[PDB]
Amino acid sequence: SSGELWGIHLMPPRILVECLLPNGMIVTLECLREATLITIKHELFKEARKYPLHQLLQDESSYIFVSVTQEAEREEFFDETRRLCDLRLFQPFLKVIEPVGNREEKILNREIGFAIGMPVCEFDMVKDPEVQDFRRNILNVCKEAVDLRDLNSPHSRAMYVYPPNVESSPELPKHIYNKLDKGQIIVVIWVIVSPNNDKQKYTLKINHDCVPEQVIAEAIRKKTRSMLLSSEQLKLCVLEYQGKYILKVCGCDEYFLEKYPLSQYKYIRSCIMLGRMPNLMLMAKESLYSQLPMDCFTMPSYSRRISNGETSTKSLWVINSALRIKILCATYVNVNIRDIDKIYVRTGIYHGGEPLCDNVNTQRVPCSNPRWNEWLNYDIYIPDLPRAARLCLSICSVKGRKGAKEEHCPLAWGNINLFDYTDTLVSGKMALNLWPVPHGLEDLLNPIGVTGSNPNKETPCLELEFDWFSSVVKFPDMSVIEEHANWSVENDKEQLKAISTRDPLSEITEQEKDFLWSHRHYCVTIPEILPKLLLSVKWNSRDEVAQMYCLVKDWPPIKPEQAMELLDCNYPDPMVRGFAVRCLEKYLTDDKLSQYLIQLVQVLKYEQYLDNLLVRFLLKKALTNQRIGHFFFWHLKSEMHNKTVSQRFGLLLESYCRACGMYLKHLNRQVEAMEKLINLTDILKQEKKDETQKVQMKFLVEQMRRPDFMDALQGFLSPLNPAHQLGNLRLEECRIMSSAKRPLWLNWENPDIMSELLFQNNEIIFKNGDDLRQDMLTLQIIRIMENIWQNQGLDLRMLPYGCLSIGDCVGLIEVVRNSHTIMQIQCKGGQFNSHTLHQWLKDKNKGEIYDAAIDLFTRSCAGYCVATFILGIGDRHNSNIMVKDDGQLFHIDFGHFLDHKKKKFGYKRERVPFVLTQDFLIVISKGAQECTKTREFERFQEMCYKAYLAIRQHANLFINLFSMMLGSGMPELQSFDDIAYIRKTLALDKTEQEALEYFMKQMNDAHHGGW
Template identity: 40%
Template sequence: MPPAKTDQLDLWAESGLDGDDQVMVDFLLPTGIYIQMEVPRESTIQHIKLLLWKEAQTYPLFSLLGEMEGHMFECVNQAAVHEELEDGTRRLCDVRPFLPVLKLITRNCGRAERILDSKIGVLIGKGLHELDALQDQEVKDFRSKMKQISEEKMQRMQLMSWGEWLRSCYSMPLEAGSLENLIDKHEASLKVSLHCTVTELMDQALKKWQTTHCPEEDIGFRSDYVLRVSGKLEFLFEDHPLNQCKVRYVVHSLFRINLVKGNKVNAEDAAKIQVRAGLFHGTELLCKTAVSSESSSRSEHVWNKTLEFDIAVCDLPRMARLCFAIYAVMDKVKKQRSTKNTHLNKYQTIPWVNTMVFDYRGQLKTGDIILHCWTSFPDELEEMLNPIGTIQTNPYTENATELHISFPEYSTQPVVFPAFDKGRGGKKFYIELKEIMERDPLSQLCENEKDLIWTLRYDCRENFPQSLPKLLLSVKWSKHEDMTQLQALLQIWPKLSPRDALELLDFNYPDQYVREFAVYCLRDMSDDELLQYLLQLVQVLRYEPYYDCALSRFLLERAQSSRKIGHFLFWHLRSEMFMPAVSVHFALILEAYCRGCIPHIEVLKKQVEALSKLKAVNELIKFGTIKTKTKQAHLKEAMMTYLCVCTYMNSKMKPLWIVYNNKLLEGDTVDIIFKNGDDLRQDMLTLQILRLMDLLWKEAKLDLRIVPYGCLATGDHSGLIEVVSSADTIANIQKTSSNMAAAAAFNKDALLNWLKDKNSGDALDKAIEEFTLSCAGYCVATYVLGIGDRHSDNIMVRSTGQLFHIDFGHILGNFKSKFGIKRERVPFILTHDFIHVIQQGKTSNTEKFGNFRQYCEEAYLILRKNGNLFITLFALMLTAGLPELTSVKDIQYLKDSLALGKTDEEALKQFRQKFDEALRESWTTKVNWMAHIVAHPS
């Protein structure tokens, strides 16, 4: 879509390309008076208000306006958000309203709060008035709780000294004397080490609480409580809202709903419409699906029928979700001839929608509800239902299919999901259990194996605690007794390592207590480790059916304790605000973060404004608004002056190359590429995994000199990429060494000679060693991840010798093809000119090549040991909407490349075969590179 006219005008005004310095603005006054007048583009908001006030004196009802200071401007900005404009030095061309319309509004007594709300709305890209307008009690309760927590945090921060504030924001260690005692509900003090962590503090306090006051009472997990700091640096325990005691009403009746009607069903006239409904716990279908009768009405389809499910209300799991699909039954003549989904041969699937059975308070839902359906429908879903889909209804209600249902009342009192009781189990051991527990997460369990795991659940706890996910898959979630037994186990289950606990946040494990246990384990993460997995932790918020959950609170707590974590949490959330399925959930967390970190708002606001300007510049260039060379020169000069942009690149999306001066780096510059039009989330995921591989290798004392440069998605198909300094592409290196483009790819001396030019003496030996190590790392990494589209323009080398790959548009074996023939026939890139560098230009130097091969094999075996972690991280991204990661079948590539399920000897044999294949077929890579260089000569 071309940029709006206002975008172009603003850019022209800033770059000096337009002579007209006036703009016509419509002003709306609180008295109902409308004034249209020209104002200078460069005027400040304060000056424009003075001009308006002078003009308004000539209009009726001016005396009703009162004092000028009692009013402020409001506009709709480029993000379609209402923004309040405070008087100040901000210019109209900086504000860039969506339309040249400014509304004058009256300030109220809550001016500071209005200003803060306005800032937050602009910052997160969703006006808080939109959240105010939602008639959703869960949203209201969550905002109220988070606002109270944030206000208390800000009050504590105001009492801090500068040193305390810095330690609070940047996670520095506490000084001696900053912790004195711990007080719980019963006012029992506890002496602790001044250097103990909050986690250790809570562990000790809970232990003393139980032994001192209530030794027989089940006090639950540490994650059931929060530590709140009072003004005197004392600590108070408060009940977690999800742990409140409620009366249990046992309902043995079968669960049922009333299917009322459907509106706006997009089907052919007189088509026979049916509704299918299923109860799921994760991806497990709890009982047989229920199907409605057929309706053949042309408009409104009315059923008014009860759908009954073969499961008692008392056996419903807490996280049960009710999934619907609406479809038209097709006659034999109109059946589709082929489709991926065999179910769709008989039925034409139309909309789907999901909802939880229990609300966020744990109460069984009752009464009428209207569900607005979604239409995008994944292939190969069981029973035509989409349990992994969002439980949010479609916010675009105007054209969405409406499904009216009603939940019955089983009691005069609310039916509340009960707290679990502790249970007891037997203890045996079977050798077969070990084999089952060592399988990868993608391995399926048969019913006999599930029964064995469940029977030996206490052996699992004692001998295979990291196998908790497999135990959870063995629970019969439709039996309340099994759920009670599981809760008893969770109370005494050993804490998992954070890496093992990540799997428990997958969609397959929706139980509230399981997810709280997972978060309890994650609290041991350092800030650096949390940043390593933050991308997945944000994505699995999609799996949380309720806004107030342990994971949301954990992320907010850690983000508000560390400015760096807060920065990345903000951008991971804001970059997906355009997605309707998560916009409310992510907006609520962003609002809570901003309220608790008000000093960070101004920094983030500058970043948002800078990105907005970069996007406008990019669109101006991309859509060819400026054509003459003179105006192009003026534009580049303006870009240099105002935006620190050196140039824009000639690829399709015209990315901007930006250069910043960094005072912290003593005058060094930071180069960044801004992309608008490309989805960077897959690159971001791939680089995160490369960073993890680098960490795992270093933990094993193997440094393969990986270059996982920075990459951050900041919005819908936009983001930033770090430019690695002192580096060039293989293509450029080859082209500069040859007079003929076609011959450049076959010059095996080009790369070695380039390194010789950049390094002399001992530095050359060091550079070749750097090249050898990094080449080994990327050979293994690109093979394991199935990274495709590897040509000489997306493999680079630094002057120091480090080789690295860029641009990860194809992963998990999705290799490009032309005319039905795969363009890449090698498992990874290992050309003879690479070997030429590794062997220092000497064909007889087989020892160097032997070392290189040993590095590759060692690196591969290290990754194999962590194969379950890689599978988990990709599985947690399944609903992110990445084009090449949409189902478990995509992750199967990792299982195959890592040879999971095989012995190390078998896996090493497989890798050696791939290594030899890469060497043997490297000539095909050179041919592809030649074709690429000829097709892209500059």
């Protein structure tokens, strides 16, 4: 039944399902797709008495079905309401074995496994103690979050389900303060909407800094003035109604639960910024409290497993021996015999990215006999080993022919954590399944990759023998380190500031490192110098690492956007990352956390253990906020196709879905809808490459005429925005594009009762086969830069539309209202004159709003020119630029966000992708034969210069974000040499004055203007 692993896509008229029977017989029953398990049981027991041995039959509801699903797992189908199609049956057979355990816990386990995408019995059947310990210990933070969710219920539960979308800072920028009449907002309030049809609208002239309590007070004082004039005491009796009303964004699922300034809410601030009237509505608080479901959380079955010891281990700092690792043998290397001559194993002790010792290699051996049995020697002492040390090694091949110049190439890489999660040094025999080398990688070793063996057993494996020191060796406690601490015993203030001001990726010299370490005590006065200080210390010692631990212990907290750098791959130490997590806990707001949730998810791969402080912080934040939890689940699910991070992300998703509450129903509905869409796109792709659009249209309407697809594609929250509800699916507008990669356009409807004034149709483009992760990163950067410009005082508003990846090369793209590509602009109305776009904007709107459209166009152009020059996005053709009707334009296809074309067609491109076309000059200059000397173009230059200077001043954040996204796996983001492009484009090394000169020279080279 569907899946197309061993079966076929499920389209039978009537499907045959075979049935067993506990007495030892088999029953053949033909049924329909829509039949339920009870329905199957009816004809099962109708013929059970017809068959012999009917006396052994028990009662009708005396036992439960069981069968085998497509995930090669045995499922006890306790839910009797499931239809015959969605059972994911691998073989059309059924069995009954009678129930043996708790029904609700296995129902919950099935829901968790479906939302995850793989059954949790895989997490049950693992012999690794770390996985079981993580699953046992993460329920502590799960239970703490669940208990926090009911502190002052029903208020806290409402805050969890509908968290307030608030701007990060209560302060309001100057460019939008002047859009209010004496600092006041006009809001429209819809009240008492009911079957009585007494819909009313009230316009309230209220200040920007008001609270929803004041808003409902004004609303009820304006509503009560019509029904009664009041005798100046009747109006005072409204003190019992302020607790009975809750604001809601009209046409959306956003409630104003928390007491905040109204201008701090993102909906109100957006309405102020774009100029639309903020339209809210009132409702009874009892309705909101009754509509939310009961929140339940029960401890799972795998807990309560708690009921080896010799000489109480030994401290690692008492060893007086070097480090020896024996390379025993490789089971196989999959390389040609006659072509490739010899192979060898290259190893090396690493800490983050920098090695702690010189790399050593085994003797080169032919492929036929991959046996070494050699004790590799490293020039690092055992006590010199840091806590976060790792053994990075790989199997490499050498081609020493054609006149020397050996062509060393990697075959398979791997990393071993030198310390267990229980602080114990690695000892004894060990076998590692080597990972495949990633595509387009040059280095011999892979220290950026995650540790652990390959779960796949058709991969090369190497046998590692570690030295044994007569007992298990444990890393010393913090008390021993503190005992070793303190045992070691001007114009320099400006130099520390100069070091702190530069970007984290700048050049650091040996004298700078020595100066930083010699002034490590004075560095407390500048808390921002911590990353430079951590690069200054060398971790292949003991006393200085103890000293740095002592310094980090008393280090003052720093900015979230600065301590968030301390979580990337360069800093693997548990103390440093714990300090960064403490800074994030005490300083990062929930809104900024949702801003950088994607990077915080992607830096979970650099963690060397599953159970640590960052994952607990992220889970505690996700379980107390459904807006954060939605994107937490989707970001963890989008990377589950990757086998290299499947296990830890799966365990995290299992914990989350165990304690996420009643959001499992909505997440499962989203999973069902997106899985049906993936199946439809796969069927239409693999089979209809050479069919005209009429054939795909008729096949799509036939597939969407089916009852199951309709029943699965209504009434679920949009994954792009959980507040938006995707109700009825109108098939009139759903269509297939011109088949770039066969994108799917889908139109839904708002099920909200008060939604006619807002948009009634929700459009999302479904793209399968295109990697959307670079687009999400580009749009996040666009959003952050736009926020920086709006905070600074520049009204350079752009359009970072929604884009989310939900799986392997598949995802959703938000569609905006009334936008036409410049291809579509010149397609109609006339071999195109230079005045085409300006005339089109004149025709679309004229009069007093012509100037607003023109200056909105100029500001959008300035913002996007600066953005695409700085980021170096792929070459902006005239088909990737779409302009709205009101004037604002935007870009859509961010294929490569860091050029990625500098290696091919030459070596140094450094190009400007988005150059001002002559039509853009004409429309920006309001239409003229000349464009350059126009003073409006001088204003455009001023906008571009100010935007570039602001981004250059804030470039540290973007560099940190790219360094955090480094380990995700995008092809153009694989090393810091990729981030060197964004470092060079902003000209961090040059000073502030000549960086603007470089920007001006580039912008003149693009425009061919001497200026």
